Ligand binder design. Structure first.
Ligand SMILES: [Cl-]
Ligand SMILES: [Cl-]
Ligand SMILES: [Cl-]
Ligand SMILES: [Cl-]
Lengths: 372, 372, 376, 376
């Protein structure tokens, strides 16, 4: 019997955390929880959950998942589900290594041969965004994600709607319909301005509108979608099937974006994907993170018929020894090749950059602004 | 033990009424109920409710609020809730004075440092409105409220839609998107004309449409909002949480406008604000009244994270000795400073102008027109 | 061109208010708003609304109603609708005297020849209630209203449910199915106890359960009604068609009980009755009041096919202010249509003026000191 | 310009955590988050949130609450809301000490003069529970909370339903309707058995059925409630207004039980209470905790008209950390409002520091080896 022996967390110099699960057989799994902003809390959670893992057979991923989720506390929100997601990724990494195959082979094998990706593109001017997109267009990309919000702060006025719309107008003029781009507001649109903004963006036909407002109610997406032809994307801030069911039942979300490093890992994200397919909703997993999280996302994409686009942030390949496995041709990525998640982690590099490891936005009136 | 000793009402030369609550400790509270149009009835109500106050400890605002609301009669509509609102304001004024702090400090302290205001601007011609707005624009204002209705009487025809739309068109041409304005119909739009009027106003992007029709059903706002990108504002004619729940559940209202001097005062308006936040609806309290009502509104604004805009009618400062506390920089007002509501009332002036204290609109067919 | 010249209000001994509308042709109308508890505020409302009346032709009741309701203010509410109701009753009194017929003849004439009435019966113990019911039974009454609970105190425990049921059981045992009684709870049951109380009352078959809890939500009655076979009655705390439509849409109420003296008078209550008929809801107008409000109720009952039972407070003090006492006599618990022109009450005005000069003028709390919701 | 200077956490014997917020003016606030089971994670959350507090004026409780809730992260959840709750309690403790009054005086003052409490009673067999209830009954208590099931094991068979009912029947037989008891099932009933269990418990009239199953759907409670007259209680597993609104919209819950130590503290629970009042839902705050959480609960109860019953864990260990023990004395099961400024607890800080140095630190499975959902 294989047994889990130790878990180790590593805080890393951007805003990442890796975890390492060791077994008595010398088979080691890697995981990547979301820390962004609550790193000490997530780390503590990982180590508290470690109590259910040490001494246990990591082959029983379902048992361990259920144990962490329901057995010793209330059902998790953003902290606990991130800790679970990280552990789950590592467990799947182990199982694939033990059985000598990529994770997707365990989960029923390939449903596709390659996966379409898209890249976030930044820039201060609209000129800076155009330039970034053109350089990636030379590298075969034709699908992008842009921040929808130009200015620092929320879209609150007709002036602020027009500035964001004009920025998009300039970006679209440089390409016409030769490229596709999604627009990500990070919830930084006021509820009153949401519908006019969405209507004004319609001539420039973005691929989706991601998180226009922050959903207080499940009805809000359905109500927004009724007014527009533009597809709405959401899922980043939802952590389990129980959260996603609410959103799917109301409708109004065209593209679901669960985060593998937040929504309870591979075990739960495969279930979210299958659930979504039954509502005719496409899957586009949220991945602004590192290579381990991206590998996890790819395994879900390669077994789920409804997966359409995979976000990637290509940095992440620093800690990966097998960089070519994640190379992109025409915006497409291939299935991971090595056993487990398919990431050969440079553990020595991880240890060194973890040894040297170290804000609030407000509106004009002094009131706190919701996190981006 | 502090005890309430006397209540006194004062009818004042515009269309205001102040009330004064005296205690045996010499700490005096001020309140401002809505009388507009039924002044003798509201005054009688205040004095009947006085029976629950005389001899009682004013520290127990919650007890007194509940006693006035439910204990001796049916639950209040427009008359009783106004009388309660006036008394409640005075009770809070007392508590703040007793404890030596502004009311917002009692209610959990500041959630913001300053509060954005907007001003009603009148004028017979569209030239007269432009001129009024430009003078306030020199005084730092960029947010306004205009009457939507030009002509005397209701918007009933295509001709009357076009005239109101052309007036707004001329106002917007003078500023472009440099100013924001809301449009207040006082319910003076016929149900059949509401949707065409709202569609015709869309190019001129007002900040909100306030009270377009008078809501017979709770469904009417939801149905209107489905057709437009423009935010709908409502709340003036609703008097308790029980009235507001109905409107919030249906949705369709973007901006809630309870009146502090109608909707049961600070005690109830803080609850309406919190309720609204749970539906992702912004608060913009209705205040076309005097300084006491405005101070009450500010205390709610300064503790409620969802408050966005505060109407003010700057006259009101005549009866206030501490005028600078309500001064406006860039459209922003500061938190009240003095204990209680933060209004030092010129009681001598109130007494004198109360000593010298003194219509029906019809349609063309002779039928009575609903009140504006 | 007849004009209203004056309105005068009178406060009277059984906490009633009468109102008198005079015209320049010498034709006088009487009305009765409900005051229970806010007498000075309702009285002030009546005189404020009088501004819309003095100088106007009282024949335009529809115009005057609409003017009082929507012209100078926000609509509705318990104060304004009670002021409006009393004024509307007097205007109808005038119109009938002018045209020389009872009010029902104006509103399309008789739909029935007599109207079943029923009375409240009180008593400290079940024996006292039984005796009062039997005394009324010897007069031909077989329909009754009783308080659901002994007296003050909210039903919030199993002990309290059980005592309330035991009382009802005892009263039912004395009669079997030979009488009908409705049970008025005055909203004095906590929401957690509502369903068990209703369930435990089922074997004793009350004709209706009236206001078991206070209607916070639109769905409250509908939810209660899905649990029981017992008819739910409500409406005494609703003051306009717009309030009643919500209740009727949701369902849950089998018997609507608008108050003619609270819900905007005859003009509004005939529209409430017609609305109710469309949802197959019976009309049993609320009337624990004086002879003017009762006459107004009768006129609605005599034109509304869905009217089923009329409450009256007669079970002698009601008749004190009326000279035409025989027009309100009861035979087998049935009342005849009013006979004289207008509302059909010959008001002893000199007795009114007399008892008005000598009229003078509480809060209940739980054990923990918190206020209890108002009951009477 | 007062500033927060330091936050310190203390883990204590009955698996409680106390938290202490210090300021530069020497005014100290105490708070009590709930830790049961994830102590290290909640403790880490408190110190992470401390970054938003150190250097700031504690008078801006609304600003600090909103900053902790929405500024640096995704909202909510059982960990963060518990950290926030404990911090919010201490800030309120500070504000009250600064202004020299109990917290309830700040939030609009008393709505009641005393608050009905009730205690959990345990026991291996029904005889043991009866005895414990009788021992408390001699102290004036007539309201109780009992475990719905003997102990661990899910009620998933007719045999298990029958044993649970037989226990309740025996306990009820000893008292008749002379006492009230609520039944806490801790979600330990399978969904297939939920309705029969509730139906079979009906004759013995529990005051409420608390958390019979785990709320998967919004409609779960509403569906259960349509089947029974028994009141359903829930809310201990909900952590914000946004969670509670869903339950209240759907209906099904008669008694809302937010935890002051889990649902974002005083600031949030007063808003939860006000939300509940609008749906006519009673407030019975969850509090199996220490004296700081209890005091926080009391302040909400004393300003919220809809508050009905306050749980306490007193039925001596609670009072161990408090020097002002008399302020929490019970008479007829009623507690008085807290007397001292702030939360009204005089914390034996030296006793706290002492017992904190000596604090040290399971998973249940079905017969088939699968994990059982967490219960306590
Ligand atoms: Cl969590
Ligand atoms: Cl009223
Ligand atoms: Cl009213
Ligand atoms: Cl959390």
């Amino acid at each position: 019997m294989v047994k889990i022996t130790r878990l180790t967390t590593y805080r890393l110099p951007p805003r990442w955390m890796f975890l390492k699960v060791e077994t008595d057989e010398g088979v080691t799994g890697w995981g990547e929880p979301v820390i962004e902003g609550r790193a000490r809390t997530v780390e503590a959670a990982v180590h508290e959950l470690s109590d259910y893992l040490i001494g246990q057979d990591p082959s029983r991923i379902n048992d361990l998942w259920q144990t962490m989720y329901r057995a010793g506390f209330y059902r998790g929100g953003p902290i606990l589900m991130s800790a679970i997601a990280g552990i789950d990724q590592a467990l799947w990494d182990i199982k694939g290594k033990v059985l000598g195959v990529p994770v997707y082979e365990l989960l029923g094998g390939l449903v596709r041969d390659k996966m379409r990706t898209y890249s976030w593109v930044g820039g201060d001017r609209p000129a800076d965004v155009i330039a970034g997109m053109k350089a990636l267009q030379a590298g075969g990309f034709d699908h992008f994600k842009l921040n929808g919000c130009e200015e620092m702060g929320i879209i609150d006025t007709s002036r602020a709607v027009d500035a964001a719309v004009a920025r998009v107008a300039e970006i679209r003029s440089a390409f016409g319909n030769t490229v596709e781009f999604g627009l990500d507001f990070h919830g930084r649109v006021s509820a009153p301005m949401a519908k006019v903004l969405i209507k004004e963006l319609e001539p420039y036909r973005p691929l989706f509108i991601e998180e226009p407002v922050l959903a207080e109610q499940a009805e809000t997406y359905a109500r927004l979608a009724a007014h527009t032809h533009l597809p709405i994307a959401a899922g980043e801030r939802m952590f389990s099937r129980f959260d996603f069911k609410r959103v799917l039942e109301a409708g109004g979300v065209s593209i679901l974006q669960p985060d593998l490093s937040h929504a309870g890992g591979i075990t739960e994200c495969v279930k979210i994907a299958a659930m979504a397919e039954a509502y005719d909703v496409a899957l586009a997993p949220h991945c602004p993170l590192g290579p381990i999280a991206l590998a996890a996302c790819l395994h879900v994409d390669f077994v789920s018929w409804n997966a359409t686009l995979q976000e990637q942030s290509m940095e992440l390949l620093d800690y990966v020894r097998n960089k070519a496995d994640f190379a992109l041709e025409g915006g497409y990525i291939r299935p991971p090749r090595l056993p487990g998640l398919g990431v050969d982690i440079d553990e020595a590099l991880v240890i060194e950059r973890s040894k040297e490891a170290p804000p609030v936005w407000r509106h004009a009136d002094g009131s706190v602004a919701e996190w981006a």
